[PDB]
Design a protein around this ligand. Structure first.
Ligand SMILES: COc1cc2c(Oc3ccc(-c4cnc(Cc5ccccc5)n(C)c4=O)cc3F)ccnc2cc1OCCCN1CCOCC1
Length: 268
């Protein structure tokens, strides 16, 4: 009962459920299941399937669909691909995504069994930068960039996907979100990596954050963070949006630091 022209625009994003199996008893965000998708050439592919249970009316479904149209257009190694969406007749809709072996980046860097070097963590920060560079080039604002929202596949390739302590100054006071506010959040993401998943601003409450920043207080330099990279963080946290670097400047800048380092436990 959605708009006919909108339904036609979405068809390329929709998966006929006749080609999807969802292992509802195999859980992986938080409602995420193992799935098996059958692609149009006959390819059986292993996916993660999330059920968007918070949907209800035509508006939300419409929003959801056009969001899907956008996400589906995005092709980049460092951006999580949407494989499709599934509109079930008797159940809330499903997002279908490629399976990511190593889950999200925050969990991966937090667990003590893993031992990423300084080069590894900068490397992970660099890949995020590349994906964000691409997203910005497509005039897409992320709004929710954080370590927890970046995925990590079998090749250790970081995928961007979608929070006051990550938000830019001008977003906290004006709910204004731009690619330059994404930059502020990417700076926080960098701090997250170089701390190996520490919680940002531990001793300041979610409401006292804005006055904290207006004092000039910033996240302290992480134990693992090289001085040139800490200066990159602070540029990302300048109050005037236009002063902050572009993601293209960040790819080129961070890459230069990355190249000075040797020793990787997780390559590519
Ligand atoms: C929970 O961990 C995983 C999560 C995975 C995953 O999560 C998701 C990421 C993004 C999205 C998502 C992406 N995009 C949108 C916007 C959108 C709006 C409208 C239309 C289309 C899209 N929305 C709304 C979304 O929800 C959904 C997800 F389910 C996707 C793929 N693979 C995953 C793999 C995982 O774990 C691998 C195993 C880890 N083990 C290892 C040993 O340690 C213990 C566990």
């Amino acid at each position: 009962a959605l708009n006919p022209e909108l339904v036609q625009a979405v068809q390329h994003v929709v998966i006929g459920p006749s080609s999807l199996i969802v292992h509802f008893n195999e859980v992986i965000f938080g409602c995420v299941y193992h799935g098996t998708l059958l692609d149009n050439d006959g390819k059986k592919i292993h996916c993660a399937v999330k059920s968007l249970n918070r949907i209800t009316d035509i508006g939300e479904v419409s929003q959801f669909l056009t969001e899907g149209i956008i996400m589906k257009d995005f092709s980049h190694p460092n951006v999580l691909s949407l494989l499709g969406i599934c509109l079930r007749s008797e159940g809330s809709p499903l997002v279908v995504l490629p399976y990511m072996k190593h889950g999200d980046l925050r969990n991966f860097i937090r667990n003590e069994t893993h031992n990423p070097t300084v080069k590894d963590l900068i490397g992970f920060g660099l890949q995020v930068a590349k994906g964000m560079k691409y997203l910005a080039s497509k005039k897409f604002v992320h709004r929710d960039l954080a370590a927890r929202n970046c995925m990590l596949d079998e090749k250790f390739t970081v995928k961007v996907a979608d929070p006051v302590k990550w938000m830019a100054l001008e977003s906290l006071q004006t709910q204004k979100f731009t690619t330059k506010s994404d930059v502020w959040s990417f700076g926080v993401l960098l701090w997250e990596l170089m701390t190996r998943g520490a919680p940002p601003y531990p001793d300041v409450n979610t409401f006292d954050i804005t006055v904290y920043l207006l004092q000039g207080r910033r996240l302290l330099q992480p134990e693992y963070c090289p001085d040139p990279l800490y200066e990159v963080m602070l540029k990302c946290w300048h109050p005037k949006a236009e002063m902050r670097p572009s993601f293209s400047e960040l790819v080129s800048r961070i890459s230069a630091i990355f190249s000075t380092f040797i020793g990787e436990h997780y390559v590519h």
